[PDB]
């Protein structure tokens, strides 16, 4: 009766349907996962989950001719979440190309691919994730955005040797790639008031483009416009 599987497709919610081909001979038809043999499903998906958990790009390239890329595992992780935590910017760029849901959320912890690239410390990956338009703002079960995460871990990286080093670099590169997304450096019209003293000086800032004035730490301002201010003071 049933010959082989040839396609997947998300029906309902995290529920699956496969495209079957036939030995009795008739035109290939869609059919619920709940309605088809274990191994025959397993035989279509295992080559897939192997490929991913080892970030095999070539393989993945082929196993996609007609496949629903956002298939989940036991913990609601899609293929993408894997290649992300492994640090394969090349894979990630490929599955993105395949329309994968960048903003997908797992069900053990509530994470996205950027929570993986973050946690697993893959900069060049995040780089790409953001390039292709991911949303950095997505929180998880712990309420953490991806950035707050890189902040937290780097709190607790070791300071031992050049092994424990490329770790610290990593978190910084991520934490800065991410910052360069939350934070712009917009030009100042005027600097209205001065608070704090010496170095911990905090300046009240008027924006050229519009809207409120706001206390920027004296660090997060320009040495050229901070001077222009305390000169008008004298």
């Amino acid at each position: 009766e049933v010959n082989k599987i040839i396609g997947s497709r998300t029906a309902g919610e995290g529920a699956m349907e496969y495209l079957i081909e036939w030995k009795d001979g008739h035109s290939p038809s869609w059919v619920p996962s709940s309605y088809i043999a274990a191994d025959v499903v397993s035989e279509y998906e295992t080559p897939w989950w192997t490929a991913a958990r080892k970030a095999d790009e070539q393989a993945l390239s082929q196993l996609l001719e007609d496949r629903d890329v956002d298939a989940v595992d036991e913990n609601g992780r899609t293929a993408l979440l894997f290649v992300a935590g492994l640090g394969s910017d090349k894979c990630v760029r490929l599955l993105a190309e395949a329309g994968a849901d960048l903003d997908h959320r797992d069900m053990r912890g509530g994470l996205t691919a950027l929570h993986m690239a973050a946690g697993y410390v893959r900069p060049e990956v995040v780089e790409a994730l953001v390039e292709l338009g991911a949303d950095i703002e997505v929180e998880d079960e712990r309420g953490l955005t991806a950035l707050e995460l890189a902040r937290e871990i780097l709190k607790t990286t070791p300071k031992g040797n050049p092994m424990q080093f490329g770790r610290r670099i990593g978190l910084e590169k991520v934490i800065n790639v991410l910052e360069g997304q939350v934070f712009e450096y917009a030009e100042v019209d005027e600097i209205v008031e001065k608070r704090g003293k010496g170095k911990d000086v905090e300046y009240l800032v008027r924006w050229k483009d519009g809207g409120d004035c706001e206390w920027v730490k004296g660090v997060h301002v320009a040495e050229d416009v901070a001077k222009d201010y305390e000169d008008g003071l004298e």
Partner: peptide, 13 residues
């Protein structure tokens, strides 16, 4: 990590 000339850090909106 110095701020560009004539600018200051804010959140993106």
């Amino acid at each position: 990590q110095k701020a560009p000339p004539g600018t200051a850090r804010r959140k993106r909106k």
